[PDB]
Structure formats: structure tokens, C-alpha cells
Amino acid sequence: SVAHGLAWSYYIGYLRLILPELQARIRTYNQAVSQRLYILLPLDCGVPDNLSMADPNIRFLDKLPQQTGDRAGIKDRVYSNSIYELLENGQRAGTCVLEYATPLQTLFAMSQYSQAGFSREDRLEQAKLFCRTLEDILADAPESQNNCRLIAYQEPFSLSQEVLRHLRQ
Amino acid sequence: SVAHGLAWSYYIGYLRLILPELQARIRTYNQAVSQRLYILLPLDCGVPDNLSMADPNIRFLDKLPQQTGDRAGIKDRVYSNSIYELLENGQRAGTCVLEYATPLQTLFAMSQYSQAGFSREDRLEQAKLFCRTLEDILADAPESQNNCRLIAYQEPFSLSQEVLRHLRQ
Ligand SMILES: O=C(O)c1cccc2cc(CNC(=O)c3cnn4cccnc34)oc12
Ligand SMILES: O=C(O)c1cccc2cc(CNC(=O)c3cnn4cccnc34)oc12
Numbered sequence A, B: 001s002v003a004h005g006l007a008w009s010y011y012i013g014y015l016r017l018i019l020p021e022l023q024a025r026i027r028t029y030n031q032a033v034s035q036r037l038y039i040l041l042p043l044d045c046g047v048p049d050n051l052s053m054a055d056p057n058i059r060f061l062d063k064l065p066q067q068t069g070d071r072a073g074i075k076d077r078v079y080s081n082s083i084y085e086l087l088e089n090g091q092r093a094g095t096c097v098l099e100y101a102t103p104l105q106t107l108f109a110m111s112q113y114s115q116a117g118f119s120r121e122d123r124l125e126q127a128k129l130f131c132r133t134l135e136d137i138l139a140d141a142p143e144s145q146n147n148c149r150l151i152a153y154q155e156p157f158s159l160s161q162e163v164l165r166h167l168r169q
Helices: A002-018 A022-029 A103-112 A120-140 A159-167 B002-018 B022-029 B103-112 B120-140 B159-167
Strands: A037-042 A058-071 A074-088 A091-100 A148-153 B037-042 B058-071 B074-088 B091-100 B148-153
Touching (some): A002 A058, A002 A103, A002 B002, A002 B103, A022 A058, A022 A074, A037 A159, A058 A091, A058 A159, A058 B074, A074 B058, A091 A159, A103 B002, B002 B058, B002 B074, B002 B120, B074 B159, B091 B159, B120 B148
Parallel strands (some): B037 B148
Antiparallel strands (some): A074 A091, B058 B074
């Protein structure tokens, strides 16, 4: 399936490369930010560029120092991550590296382009299969050593509360 | 198929975003470099990080000024491209933005991991289907306006000569 290929490329072309170096980048920034990469997986494939627009209680703090690596003819290809503070009744309840799983934008876009041959009704099913495949990959991956957490959800809602339930172990 | 999803995500998550801004970045660097993004598509899915290791006549010149954009919770996500000089009998015969199509690394890796459920024999077929799907996408895409060229090839070989045949219109 397309969700199967998306989960494998997201692991091979991104997670496999940043998850080994992540704790070192977090330690560097901490000179406190939590140790895992928190990945938001909205099953509706709704991926806004601004997290604060999804929930005002999710607030951008700072960028994590960039990771660079020569890859496939690209000198110093850059991998960037953002740090967010999570508010709960006016209080900073958590601080973590947080982002949406970008392949869900591909599912959203493919469901909209007629040439992609993917119906708008198939988004939910493909997102669920992307989630399951990625969980199966990370469960058995050596690069994932208590440093990655997938947060999958369907709105019937507090996004910051869903993140916080995961942050609080 | 997985090649279908890879071609659509490579377009949606990368090409769709950089191809509109590419001529402006090339004009900026030129204050001469050719106007198209040249994408190497080895059908054997062999993707080395160093182009000069694939052919000594392909020589790294400089980085093209980075492109940044806020995306899916990432503040200032970076898109980087490299400029190469192409030598032919000691002479600089061309200068272009050149890189390998990264999803071919996913096909290579999936053919090696038992959990991916993709045989090592299926690489060639999947790379060909990735190529055809991407050509079909770019043929009809509004972002592609004489600014992208796919260079697909099978070794029986000069890589620099294959690039140069495309560079010379
Ligand atoms: O990297 C993958 O293995 C991969 C596999 C499938 C689909 C996609 C979509 C992307 C996004 N690309 C970038 O962010 C990017 C930034 N500089 N840059 C230079 C060359 C190529 N890509 C990029 O990567 C993919
Ligand atoms: O971007 C896509 O739409 C896409 C779709 C499918 C597979 C892949 C693999 C990649 C490579 N990722 C990066 O280069 C990258 C760099 N910073 N960063 C921050 C968050 C996420 N990804 C990245 O992007 C994909």
C-alpha cells in the first residue's frame, strides 16, 4: 500500500537518521526539555503549519540545534526540530520536541488530486495503516531507544491534553 | 503501490515546495548555473552520498542559498540543494543543481529489511514505476515550468556524460 511505503520512507529518510542524534541535541540545548521526539498523528490527516492554531495551549519555545549530513549528492542536508511548551490552566505543564508526522499531508493531498487515484473517503483508513506500520517499525528498530513517541488521535477536544497524557509517562 | 506513494510524497513534500522558488535562488547565486533542477534516477537504486565517488567528472562547486518555510509544526524547515560542475576531458562542460532522487534509497532499504515485505529482485521494477509516476506528475504539474529534469538510467558507463546529454537540451 501507499501508507506502507510512507511509513517506511519516513523511517528510512528521516527517523532512522535523527533518532540516534536526538538525545545529544536535547542535552546540548538543556546545556527542562523532555528526551523523546513526540510525533502528532491526526487520523483526519489535518496538518496545520502552526501548532498554536491547532491549540493555543501549545506554544512555540525555540528551535533545537540543527542536524546536518551529506546525503544523496546534497552537501549538508538539514534536519530541523521545534520545542514547544504545553500550558494547562495558565501553567507550563511540559516542554518537548513536538511535530506532526509530515506523510499525513501526502495522504491528504493524494485524496484531493484526481491523478493520485486515492478517494477522499480513504484518508482515515490510510492514516490508521500508516500509524500501525510506523509503530511496528519503531517497536523493532535499534535507533528507537525510549526516544520516540507517536500520538495518534481522532477528534470527536484538547490536543495539549493528549500530548500531556503521553508526557506524564 | 509503494513506488506510487513515494513519487506522490516526493512531489507533495518536496518538489511542489522548491520548484516555484528555484529560479529565484539560481538568479540570486548567479548574482553560469543552469535553470533546471537535475534529478538523478539510477534504476539500480544505488544512491551514494558523494556524487564525485559515482563519477570523478562530477565535482561539487557550492551550495545554493537555503530555502526555509514553517511546516507541520517545524519552524523554518530547511530545503538545501547542491551545485556541481561537469567535466569533459579536463574542461568544465556544464554547471547545474544536481542530486539523486532520495526515495530510491527507501526502495533499496525496504528490499533489505525482512519486515518491509519487498524482495531484493523488485528494486528495478519499483524504481521504473517510481520514475514513470513522477514523470506523469511533473508533466501535468503547474510548479514544473521548464525547471525540472529527471535523468533515469541503467548501467550496462559515464554519469557525467548522461547529465551532459540532458544539459545540452
Ligand atoms: O528524504 C527522503 O528519503 C524522502 C522520501 C520520500 C519522500 C520525501 C519527501 C521529502 C522531503 N524533502 C526534504 O525535506 C528535503 C530537503 N532538502 N532536500 C534535498 C533533496 C531532497 N529532499 C530534500 O523527503 C522524502
Ligand atoms: O516531508 C515529507 O512530506 C515526507 C514524506 C514522506 C517521507 C519523508 C522523509 C522525509 C525527510 N525528512 C526531512 O528531510 C526532514 C527535515 N526536517 N524535518 C522535520 C520534520 C520531518 N521531516 C523532516 O520527508 C518525508
